[PDB]
């Protein structure tokens, strides 16, 4: 019924993009029984904007394909005038929370559709330049590690098992054991200040373990510490406490902050981004599946969530192993990494320029090991990632330290374009990964058994 | 496979509840093809706790009914030791974000189920007493309005149309026009500091409109102002600016703060709750449908979201018209209101005591009017609600002020247990609501035409 | 030399005051050898404003009396255009820090005077209405105590001895012992989180002592807890921690916050005033003597410091016993109390209206006891003060609880206009104060020995 | 009377220092008539500590010289057990405010002395390591300027005249004019957000002037922007706003923050130090004369104030021209610079180690010019200072840009150990400073007229 006002299917998407005055959003939408696709689409545009000088700022349906997705619905595109979006009193920037409240707010509760899912969105220059974006990313880690800041490459990481329940001294010992070979360690997403492992007991022991490993290896080590909380004053207290403990050893810039960004919401990410901009903001997505799982016809696709994380200021975020590990996996998920790290990236429906906004670094995890990293790097096109390997490190038959080394050595091998089996003859930890995971070696490198003994 | 460790189906739920040492959660879960219900359930418990002294804090599957929901899956219940939950350094309280990250975190991304949905949860005394809870609710509005703080009753509200796009002077004029009869006005959820209606232009005009209406009517008026932002410093700036503008007229405690709590996340709600505890925190759910819509097999049921909002400190939150307005509606949704406002409430799977935690006030909206309010009150059992009526107020044939009066008069009629038609003979605005909405009057009060002329 | 620009002795002070566009300041100034009084005065005006459209905002010397103070110098008055003063981005209010930086900033370091002291200042309406002012004062304590909020009267307090060094349990015990008779207890100004009495050990014991005393007496008790710190995040952590501990007993609004406002500076007072406005801000002046002692020819007179404390938002501040206790004392210091608590007050050089800005409550201390309070009240004209008595309470021969009662009973006696000796016959604790301090009784009430036995 | 408890003149200062368990303070004190020097000294120790397990933490008088200062009093030294000092809940560090409240708090108001002045103090290692200290100093400016971070040398600055009153466009133009030759510009201490030059009008113009000057010169420029306020939320708003405006040109790390630290107090400095640690904190002392002027027998000597500023985290602070400019001046004030910038420094009574705490950079100002800088550098021993020259820059007969160059060229000449007159033959701006200030050239370089024409 509102299609006359809130729909203009004669608008051309290219004119909307070249004009630079609209945010565009593509959705998958399924009309409820009795309702027409255009009528529901126009209703969505109204609910997502002026709900009805007002004409100039109406959101407009400009494209529909009612049959695009068969029994899962059709394609819907809406243009949002940039004047709809809010501005901080302090710095005039757009809140992410506010943008979300328009393009995916009340329209998620409507009764005249059976599903409404964001697939992609386009931000014009005037909007992109008005979000925080990241302040820190892997480039700052490369600097702390003594690497080039251009293509400093791969950072070998792990997660400690059991992920929750270890008392303070056993946790610090596991950190030390790995840091004798590996580089990066993170808290588990709900590991913080439980009574059985209080923050102010475990953090001093971890700082001491870092110092010991660094003195014994001569190599710099990194720790990502959970500061998740609801209250900004608490997250400030956690971060300041942690940085001061690491500062007692000269290692304050070896600390990253883990923030469970989905369960805090954008406001919690913004607390860390604004108060601690120069501390790497490690965005943990725990819980995001409720919003982004393909099993839901609501919410948004993972690529959209990635774009929003970069705008909020994530220094790094989990992306996935892209079919080379042990999760949901296709080599074609590389677009999630590209959209996070490149200055420009083609998305499923919109080409996105980032106009110099800093990259968000992909954090790879999901049953990866040294043998698998070669194919993973080759598919991605680079190795500028952080990688947490649970079994790929502690599952090394020579121990977690050897596991960590075997991961670094996988990066060297790829970087050199060397033959993995020939490379292994001169690099023991990589060679011993073949024996640690021979099911994978038999597959990827048939013949290794004879060539390596 | 992990069922031996992470499942104990011999545990009795009543023993877990009477013991007071576990949070319990009920889920609807559908196993993926090839996986057994118990195996997946145990995997969920592991992923949601210790991921594997550790045995004492494992989450445990204690009840399953694999066929409870037919093709939508089965019922799964998990017990979480209270020792799993985090504690603020500052005040030892539990973060809501953290609790969410365990009971509905990584388990939302697992590949061995086709759906995992929270239906209800149980907090024992030791946990309930360790959340913020609300600091302010309708009782504080009753005080400002000169009402009894016991059963002060109904607050007549409206929303301004168009909800977004009005320039500052037309918006303030609409506020004045309604406040000559009604009491409560709110911003629209994305209405804030747009260039076409800057905060520092519209807020002074609204404060002036309140003052004028209060001087002309002798009655106190209320305004709920949007302070949504990502950054705590910005939300502080907005709130302090707004309170100071209303303070210039002596009306600072006539201000409530609207916070789009789903798109800010719990951290944004906590900013308002901690910095502005004595300013009514009006929680707007815009976007929550992605998490709570019944169209998704992920996320959580609305009742769970309501419980979480109270723990975070919402002073009020939208619940719905419960089948008496024009939305998704059943009289049985009254449990959402009861769980928000009562000191104790039976939920779908767990009885919940709140141990003196303040109520969160239901904010009713969705095509309500004066005629309909009688049946709505009778079903709910009380009228201690805030109610925003768009058409029920501005749709009054005598204008928004008359509409607002007709809503108050509906409360009086119910409160008096009077016959609505007899009551209308002595209350003109209520009587004129019959003519404003005669389709409803013909239905609810057949005969009114003759008795009222 | 700059007298032609920065001096206009033809300006009339009454015209400057009635115009409402200037802050005026009176100083005592002593020229250095070789310099003329007017030349130095004009230099001060230049240094305190434009240092030289600029003419419209120059500060102007409008009155001088070179011989007013003999060998201590002369009188100097300067008019500051209100346009010179700063405005917060957030709420447009004047920072106290900024105002201080102009009227008493670089002019304190000049080499062409041997002394420059602020004696008084005048704020016009447009400025007074643009400072924070207090949010809380004794009226809020009266409410918590179940008193009338009009002239609720005297609050009997004490300080614990030794003021610093008591371990947590002995300190809480002393609090309990006094609270069985008295009402108000404060931390000592440097008593906070020392290793020998950690905050998180002593505060729970004090909260428990309050609860016990309140259950046993049926009377409400008050505690003023030190939250002094440099860092706003720490002061927030302290205040939230303390309020939560008292909230466990339902006594959160029985807490006041002590802030060492001179050593934090105005910024620290503002942290408490903005974050915790509804918690009584007990301003402790420790260290102010460097700025306000009459032994210095620099700085400002105590009356000026009092005015600044009210503008910053002190709920109460120490004033002194005004010659009725054991300190620097003259009955004429009552102007310090009047300037803090009245809506209008004559100062030494300027009449000051406060335009409804809340009172700052006088906190009396300095060797007062029940016998002395009568004359003190009569001189002041009221008893709306908080009073901490060290010896007047614990020095009671029947103990601190009896001492506290004897102080309340002194207020009752004055309030009743009763004869103190006749009153004592029917009030045992007051009567026993005569025996506790007979040197004072012999003086003030000759004959008591016979009439009371 | 309390000398038996609070005095132990048999203690040896060297034992107290080598033990590392006491802060020591030296004072000048004058007893009031009738009081003995030791009795008053012991009273001061009591008032400054336990006011009376308590014995172990008493402050102790360990040295007195009653005649040390003739009619100005005698010397008094007091030892403070480190256990007396407070600890943040967050990071366990000592608040400066709290330390001040003990060693120079209530003892400033006592009636049994006619003066009590801090001359020096000693912090042992355990205390020094427990203060914030600076996070940023001139080394970070050297990095932004492309200089070595070791001895990067002199930064040529100016102040704009008139210091207060310029509208936004004329102020930005003056900044541009100077930046074509000079490097560093600062706001005046009370210049901020006045109605005649609003922050959000002038700051964008200054950022644009920086960009233009940098594009035209190819050299990096620096601006120190006033963020002084009482309220931490306002100072955050100012700083974030300013950094974002400079970030629009890629110049966010070209910004320093000016904080009027005396009138905000330590709490305001801490806000900037904690929220903006990596932005150079330019501490402006406006008003400190009330506390540190030698005309007062109260307060503290400038050297003490300098030590406190470093502990609070000042990146730089004004010291003075040390007799080479036009102020209070003696070459021997170089100790103020040495105590701020060295890792170890002898003070008037105590040798102070800083244990790696970052330097606070001296900011030199007070009628300096290029000719005078040579002798100033030679006396100081280095040129690692920031220098604001009002007349030494704009007073150059060829303009402010030429003036700024002449200052840089003075540094080069000193650095080269070259003869100033010979150097001038090959450096025009330096040569033209001789003509700009020939009174100084005739004095310092007799003969220049003939050698340079």
PDB file of N, CA and C in Angstrom, chain C residues 47 50 53 83-84 86-87 89-90 96-98 102 105-106 110 113 163-165 189-190 193-194 196 230 234 238 263-267 287 295-297, chain D residues 47 50 53 83-84 86-87 89-90 96-98 102 105-106 110 113 163-165 189-190 193-194 196 230 234 238 263-267 287 295-297:
ATOM      1  N   UNK C  47      47.700  40.762  32.452  1.00  0.00           N
ATOM      2  CA  UNK C  47      48.144  39.382  32.607  1.00  0.00           C
ATOM      3  C   UNK C  47      46.978  38.446  32.874  1.00  0.00           C
ATOM      4  N   UNK C  50      43.721  39.666  28.460  1.00  0.00           N
ATOM      5  CA  UNK C  50      44.126  39.612  27.064  1.00  0.00           C
ATOM      6  C   UNK C  50      45.631  39.703  26.865  1.00  0.00           C
ATOM      7  N   UNK C  53      39.423  43.077  17.978  1.00  0.00           N
ATOM      8  CA  UNK C  53      38.249  42.867  18.819  1.00  0.00           C
ATOM      9  C   UNK C  53      38.643  42.784  20.298  1.00  0.00           C
ATOM     10  N   UNK C  83      32.468  37.486  28.939  1.00  0.00           N
ATOM     11  CA  UNK C  83      32.849  36.818  27.702  1.00  0.00           C
ATOM     12  C   UNK C  83      34.222  36.168  27.795  1.00  0.00           C
ATOM     13  N   UNK C  84      35.021  36.532  28.798  1.00  0.00           N
ATOM     14  CA  UNK C  84      36.323  35.906  28.967  1.00  0.00           C
ATOM     15  C   UNK C  84      36.227  34.451  29.406  1.00  0.00           C
ATOM     16  N   UNK C  86      35.169  30.452  30.055  1.00  0.00           N
ATOM     17  CA  UNK C  86      35.084  29.296  29.179  1.00  0.00           C
ATOM     18  C   UNK C  86      33.727  28.615  29.305  1.00  0.00           C
ATOM     19  N   UNK C  87      33.441  27.748  28.333  1.00  0.00           N
ATOM     20  CA  UNK C  87      32.184  27.015  28.273  1.00  0.00           C
ATOM     21  C   UNK C  87      32.439  25.563  27.907  1.00  0.00           C
ATOM     22  N   UNK C  89      31.928  22.157  26.206  1.00  0.00           N
ATOM     23  CA  UNK C  89      31.244  21.651  25.021  1.00  0.00           C
ATOM     24  C   UNK C  89      29.953  20.929  25.394  1.00  0.00           C
ATOM     25  N   UNK C  90      29.952  20.221  26.526  1.00  0.00           N
ATOM     26  CA  UNK C  90      28.835  19.336  26.846  1.00  0.00           C
ATOM     27  C   UNK C  90      27.603  20.138  27.252  1.00  0.00           C
ATOM     28  N   UNK C  96      35.364  25.848  36.860  1.00  0.00           N
ATOM     29  CA  UNK C  96      35.985  26.573  37.965  1.00  0.00           C
ATOM     30  C   UNK C  96      37.483  26.706  37.734  1.00  0.00           C
ATOM     31  N   UNK C  97      38.122  25.624  37.285  1.00  0.00           N
ATOM     32  CA  UNK C  97      39.548  25.659  36.987  1.00  0.00           C
ATOM     33  C   UNK C  97      39.884  26.818  36.059  1.00  0.00           C
ATOM     34  N   UNK C  98      39.096  26.988  34.996  1.00  0.00           N
ATOM     35  CA  UNK C  98      39.377  28.049  34.040  1.00  0.00           C
ATOM     36  C   UNK C  98      39.216  29.431  34.664  1.00  0.00           C
ATOM     37  N   UNK C 102      42.255  32.625  35.260  1.00  0.00           N
ATOM     38  CA  UNK C 102      42.257  34.023  34.855  1.00  0.00           C
ATOM     39  C   UNK C 102      42.405  34.962  36.047  1.00  0.00           C
ATOM     40  N   UNK C 105      45.665  33.352  38.264  1.00  0.00           N
ATOM     41  CA  UNK C 105      46.551  32.444  37.564  1.00  0.00           C
ATOM     42  C   UNK C 105      47.966  32.966  37.459  1.00  0.00           C
ATOM     43  N   UNK C 106      48.366  33.368  36.252  1.00  0.00           N
ATOM     44  CA  UNK C 106      49.717  33.877  36.058  1.00  0.00           C
ATOM     45  C   UNK C 106      49.992  35.108  36.910  1.00  0.00           C
ATOM     46  N   UNK C 110      53.994  37.182  39.225  1.00  0.00           N
ATOM     47  CA  UNK C 110      54.587  38.385  38.666  1.00  0.00           C
ATOM     48  C   UNK C 110      55.679  38.936  39.574  1.00  0.00           C
ATOM     49  N   UNK C 113      55.124  42.776  41.870  1.00  0.00           N
ATOM     50  CA  UNK C 113      54.458  42.895  43.159  1.00  0.00           C
ATOM     51  C   UNK C 113      55.110  41.958  44.169  1.00  0.00           C
ATOM     52  N   UNK C 163      43.508   8.680  64.236  1.00  0.00           N
ATOM     53  CA  UNK C 163      42.845   8.941  62.966  1.00  0.00           C
ATOM     54  C   UNK C 163      43.384   8.048  61.857  1.00  0.00           C
ATOM     55  N   UNK C 164      44.630   7.595  61.969  1.00  0.00           N
ATOM     56  CA  UNK C 164      45.216   6.722  60.960  1.00  0.00           C
ATOM     57  C   UNK C 164      46.087   5.689  61.656  1.00  0.00           C
ATOM     58  N   UNK C 165      45.908   4.422  61.281  1.00  0.00           N
ATOM     59  CA  UNK C 165      46.666   3.345  61.884  1.00  0.00           C
ATOM     60  C   UNK C 165      45.833   2.201  62.430  1.00  0.00           C
ATOM     61  N   UNK C 189      41.086  12.086  56.620  1.00  0.00           N
ATOM     62  CA  UNK C 189      41.316  12.493  55.236  1.00  0.00           C
ATOM     63  C   UNK C 189      42.341  11.641  54.483  1.00  0.00           C
ATOM     64  N   UNK C 190      43.330  10.992  55.124  1.00  0.00           N
ATOM     65  CA  UNK C 190      44.271  10.159  54.364  1.00  0.00           C
ATOM     66  C   UNK C 190      44.048   8.673  54.601  1.00  0.00           C
ATOM     67  N   UNK C 193      43.073   3.044  51.549  1.00  0.00           N
ATOM     68  CA  UNK C 193      43.394   1.674  51.165  1.00  0.00           C
ATOM     69  C   UNK C 193      44.847   1.337  51.480  1.00  0.00           C
ATOM     70  N   UNK C 194      45.311   1.720  52.665  1.00  0.00           N
ATOM     71  CA  UNK C 194      46.631   1.318  53.125  1.00  0.00           C
ATOM     72  C   UNK C 194      46.705  -0.194  53.331  1.00  0.00           C
ATOM     73  N   UNK C 196      47.854  -1.868  55.780  1.00  0.00           N
ATOM     74  CA  UNK C 196      47.497  -2.330  57.117  1.00  0.00           C
ATOM     75  C   UNK C 196      46.000  -2.238  57.394  1.00  0.00           C
ATOM     76  N   UNK C 230      43.572  10.305  42.393  1.00  0.00           N
ATOM     77  CA  UNK C 230      43.867  11.164  41.251  1.00  0.00           C
ATOM     78  C   UNK C 230      42.996  10.812  40.048  1.00  0.00           C
ATOM     79  N   UNK C 234      39.567   5.350  39.187  1.00  0.00           N
ATOM     80  CA  UNK C 234      39.769   4.820  40.529  1.00  0.00           C
ATOM     81  C   UNK C 234      38.716   5.356  41.487  1.00  0.00           C
ATOM     82  N   UNK C 238      36.186   3.079  43.659  1.00  0.00           N
ATOM     83  CA  UNK C 238      36.016   3.177  45.106  1.00  0.00           C
ATOM     84  C   UNK C 238      34.561   3.429  45.475  1.00  0.00           C
ATOM     85  N   UNK C 263      43.664  18.769  47.435  1.00  0.00           N
ATOM     86  CA  UNK C 263      44.773  18.021  46.857  1.00  0.00           C
ATOM     87  C   UNK C 263      44.376  17.280  45.582  1.00  0.00           C
ATOM     88  N   UNK C 264      43.083  16.992  45.367  1.00  0.00           N
ATOM     89  CA  UNK C 264      42.667  16.520  44.048  1.00  0.00           C
ATOM     90  C   UNK C 264      42.534  17.674  43.062  1.00  0.00           C
ATOM     91  N   UNK C 265      42.179  18.852  43.569  1.00  0.00           N
ATOM     92  CA  UNK C 265      41.801  19.967  42.744  1.00  0.00           C
ATOM     93  C   UNK C 265      40.343  19.890  42.345  1.00  0.00           C
ATOM     94  N   UNK C 266      39.842  20.978  41.764  1.00  0.00           N
ATOM     95  CA  UNK C 266      38.452  20.991  41.283  1.00  0.00           C
ATOM     96  C   UNK C 266      38.092  19.815  40.392  1.00  0.00           C
ATOM     97  N   UNK C 267      39.041  19.270  39.631  1.00  0.00           N
ATOM     98  CA  UNK C 267      38.690  18.173  38.736  1.00  0.00           C
ATOM     99  C   UNK C 267      38.253  16.942  39.525  1.00  0.00           C
ATOM    100  N   UNK C 287      45.192  20.644  53.275  1.00  0.00           N
ATOM    101  CA  UNK C 287      46.192  21.277  52.452  1.00  0.00           C
ATOM    102  C   UNK C 287      45.856  22.688  52.013  1.00  0.00           C
ATOM    103  N   UNK C 295      48.921  33.869  56.743  1.00  0.00           N
ATOM    104  CA  UNK C 295      50.364  34.033  56.763  1.00  0.00           C
ATOM    105  C   UNK C 295      50.948  34.209  55.370  1.00  0.00           C
ATOM    106  N   UNK C 296      50.160  33.980  54.316  1.00  0.00           N
ATOM    107  CA  UNK C 296      50.636  34.174  52.962  1.00  0.00           C
ATOM    108  C   UNK C 296      50.041  35.436  52.349  1.00  0.00           C
ATOM    109  N   UNK C 297      50.857  36.254  51.677  1.00  0.00           N
ATOM    110  CA  UNK C 297      50.324  37.399  50.929  1.00  0.00           C
ATOM    111  C   UNK C 297      49.831  37.036  49.539  1.00  0.00           C
TER     112      UNK C 297
ATOM    113  N   UNK D  47      50.249  15.449  63.255  1.00  0.00           N
ATOM    114  CA  UNK D  47      49.164  15.910  62.398  1.00  0.00           C
ATOM    115  C   UNK D  47      49.288  15.353  60.991  1.00  0.00           C
ATOM    116  N   UNK D  50      49.559   9.859  62.140  1.00  0.00           N
ATOM    117  CA  UNK D  50      48.589   9.104  62.917  1.00  0.00           C
ATOM    118  C   UNK D  50      47.751   9.970  63.847  1.00  0.00           C
ATOM    119  N   UNK D  53      48.733  -0.888  67.017  1.00  0.00           N
ATOM    120  CA  UNK D  53      49.646  -1.053  65.890  1.00  0.00           C
ATOM    121  C   UNK D  53      50.143   0.307  65.386  1.00  0.00           C
ATOM    122  N   UNK D  83      54.289   2.699  54.525  1.00  0.00           N
ATOM    123  CA  UNK D  83      53.000   2.066  54.768  1.00  0.00           C
ATOM    124  C   UNK D  83      51.883   3.083  54.955  1.00  0.00           C
ATOM    125  N   UNK D  84      52.222   4.349  55.198  1.00  0.00           N
ATOM    126  CA  UNK D  84      51.198   5.374  55.333  1.00  0.00           C
ATOM    127  C   UNK D  84      50.494   5.683  54.019  1.00  0.00           C
ATOM    128  N   UNK D  86      48.692   5.585  50.241  1.00  0.00           N
ATOM    129  CA  UNK D  86      47.506   4.922  49.727  1.00  0.00           C
ATOM    130  C   UNK D  86      47.829   4.123  48.470  1.00  0.00           C
ATOM    131  N   UNK D  87      46.895   3.243  48.108  1.00  0.00           N
ATOM    132  CA  UNK D  87      47.034   2.377  46.946  1.00  0.00           C
ATOM    133  C   UNK D  87      45.732   2.329  46.166  1.00  0.00           C
ATOM    134  N   UNK D  89      42.829   0.846  44.133  1.00  0.00           N
ATOM    135  CA  UNK D  89      42.240  -0.471  43.925  1.00  0.00           C
ATOM    136  C   UNK D  89      42.628  -1.042  42.565  1.00  0.00           C
ATOM    137  N   UNK D  90      42.734  -0.184  41.547  1.00  0.00           N
ATOM    138  CA  UNK D  90      42.893  -0.670  40.179  1.00  0.00           C
ATOM    139  C   UNK D  90      44.295  -1.229  39.959  1.00  0.00           C
ATOM    140  N   UNK D  96      48.989  10.895  43.975  1.00  0.00           N
ATOM    141  CA  UNK D  96      49.719  12.104  44.347  1.00  0.00           C
ATOM    142  C   UNK D  96      48.897  12.939  45.318  1.00  0.00           C
ATOM    143  N   UNK D  97      47.598  13.076  45.045  1.00  0.00           N
ATOM    144  CA  UNK D  97      46.713  13.817  45.935  1.00  0.00           C
ATOM    145  C   UNK D  97      46.839  13.320  47.368  1.00  0.00           C
ATOM    146  N   UNK D  98      46.823  11.998  47.552  1.00  0.00           N
ATOM    147  CA  UNK D  98      46.898  11.445  48.897  1.00  0.00           C
ATOM    148  C   UNK D  98      48.236  11.750  49.561  1.00  0.00           C
ATOM    149  N   UNK D 102      49.089  14.129  53.222  1.00  0.00           N
ATOM    150  CA  UNK D 102      49.823  13.783  54.432  1.00  0.00           C
ATOM    151  C   UNK D 102      50.992  14.730  54.679  1.00  0.00           C
ATOM    152  N   UNK D 105      49.323  18.619  54.204  1.00  0.00           N
ATOM    153  CA  UNK D 105      47.882  18.731  54.296  1.00  0.00           C
ATOM    154  C   UNK D 105      47.431  19.591  55.456  1.00  0.00           C
ATOM    155  N   UNK D 106      46.869  18.956  56.486  1.00  0.00           N
ATOM    156  CA  UNK D 106      46.397  19.706  57.641  1.00  0.00           C
ATOM    157  C   UNK D 106      47.521  20.477  58.319  1.00  0.00           C
ATOM    158  N   UNK D 110      47.995  24.813  60.900  1.00  0.00           N
ATOM    159  CA  UNK D 110      48.205  24.759  62.337  1.00  0.00           C
ATOM    160  C   UNK D 110      48.466  26.146  62.909  1.00  0.00           C
ATOM    161  N   UNK D 113      52.532  27.333  64.453  1.00  0.00           N
ATOM    162  CA  UNK D 113      53.629  27.830  63.635  1.00  0.00           C
ATOM    163  C   UNK D 113      53.173  29.048  62.840  1.00  0.00           C
ATOM    164  N   UNK D 163      47.207  37.171  23.557  1.00  0.00           N
ATOM    165  CA  UNK D 163      47.079  35.778  23.962  1.00  0.00           C
ATOM    166  C   UNK D 163      45.621  35.355  24.065  1.00  0.00           C
ATOM    167  N   UNK D 164      44.714  36.293  24.324  1.00  0.00           N
ATOM    168  CA  UNK D 164      43.295  35.974  24.423  1.00  0.00           C
ATOM    169  C   UNK D 164      42.496  37.110  23.805  1.00  0.00           C
ATOM    170  N   UNK D 165      41.543  36.757  22.942  1.00  0.00           N
ATOM    171  CA  UNK D 165      40.726  37.749  22.275  1.00  0.00           C
ATOM    172  C   UNK D 165      40.677  37.630  20.764  1.00  0.00           C
ATOM    173  N   UNK D 189      46.861  29.803  28.146  1.00  0.00           N
ATOM    174  CA  UNK D 189      46.301  28.923  29.169  1.00  0.00           C
ATOM    175  C   UNK D 189      44.796  29.088  29.397  1.00  0.00           C
ATOM    176  N   UNK D 190      44.165  30.251  29.147  1.00  0.00           N
ATOM    177  CA  UNK D 190      42.715  30.353  29.350  1.00  0.00           C
ATOM    178  C   UNK D 190      41.953  30.429  28.036  1.00  0.00           C
ATOM    179  N   UNK D 193      37.100  27.714  24.713  1.00  0.00           N
ATOM    180  CA  UNK D 193      35.808  27.695  24.037  1.00  0.00           C
ATOM    181  C   UNK D 193      34.975  28.918  24.398  1.00  0.00           C
ATOM    182  N   UNK D 194      35.598  30.092  24.403  1.00  0.00           N
ATOM    183  CA  UNK D 194      34.865  31.335  24.585  1.00  0.00           C
ATOM    184  C   UNK D 194      33.913  31.589  23.419  1.00  0.00           C
ATOM    185  N   UNK D 196      33.438  34.228  21.706  1.00  0.00           N
ATOM    186  CA  UNK D 196      34.004  34.989  20.598  1.00  0.00           C
ATOM    187  C   UNK D 196      35.001  34.181  19.774  1.00  0.00           C
ATOM    188  N   UNK D 230      37.015  21.046  34.323  1.00  0.00           N
ATOM    189  CA  UNK D 230      36.850  20.374  35.607  1.00  0.00           C
ATOM    190  C   UNK D 230      36.454  18.912  35.424  1.00  0.00           C
ATOM    191  N   UNK D 234      34.142  16.152  30.005  1.00  0.00           N
ATOM    192  CA  UNK D 234      34.368  17.296  29.133  1.00  0.00           C
ATOM    193  C   UNK D 234      35.781  17.274  28.567  1.00  0.00           C
ATOM    194  N   UNK D 238      36.702  17.249  24.635  1.00  0.00           N
ATOM    195  CA  UNK D 238      37.604  18.198  23.989  1.00  0.00           C
ATOM    196  C   UNK D 238      38.734  17.480  23.264  1.00  0.00           C
ATOM    197  N   UNK D 263      45.272  24.536  38.412  1.00  0.00           N
ATOM    198  CA  UNK D 263      43.883  24.884  38.684  1.00  0.00           C
ATOM    199  C   UNK D 263      42.937  23.701  38.490  1.00  0.00           C
ATOM    200  N   UNK D 264      43.316  22.680  37.705  1.00  0.00           N
ATOM    201  CA  UNK D 264      42.538  21.443  37.719  1.00  0.00           C
ATOM    202  C   UNK D 264      42.879  20.587  38.932  1.00  0.00           C
ATOM    203  N   UNK D 265      44.122  20.680  39.396  1.00  0.00           N
ATOM    204  CA  UNK D 265      44.649  19.779  40.385  1.00  0.00           C
ATOM    205  C   UNK D 265      45.164  18.504  39.751  1.00  0.00           C
ATOM    206  N   UNK D 266      45.863  17.700  40.549  1.00  0.00           N
ATOM    207  CA  UNK D 266      46.359  16.407  40.052  1.00  0.00           C
ATOM    208  C   UNK D 266      45.297  15.548  39.389  1.00  0.00           C
ATOM    209  N   UNK D 267      44.035  15.645  39.808  1.00  0.00           N
ATOM    210  CA  UNK D 267      43.020  14.787  39.208  1.00  0.00           C
ATOM    211  C   UNK D 267      42.828  15.116  37.731  1.00  0.00           C
ATOM    212  N   UNK D 287      48.737  29.810  38.034  1.00  0.00           N
ATOM    213  CA  UNK D 287      48.210  29.856  39.375  1.00  0.00           C
ATOM    214  C   UNK D 287      49.114  29.257  40.434  1.00  0.00           C
ATOM    215  N   UNK D 295      57.470  34.427  48.196  1.00  0.00           N
ATOM    216  CA  UNK D 295      56.827  35.409  49.052  1.00  0.00           C
ATOM    217  C   UNK D 295      55.918  34.770  50.090  1.00  0.00           C
ATOM    218  N   UNK D 296      55.638  33.469  49.976  1.00  0.00           N
ATOM    219  CA  UNK D 296      54.820  32.784  50.955  1.00  0.00           C
ATOM    220  C   UNK D 296      55.670  31.887  51.847  1.00  0.00           C
ATOM    221  N   UNK D 297      55.444  31.914  53.163  1.00  0.00           N
ATOM    222  CA  UNK D 297      56.112  30.964  54.060  1.00  0.00           C
ATOM    223  C   UNK D 297      55.412  29.618  54.145  1.00  0.00           C
TER     224      UNK D 297
END
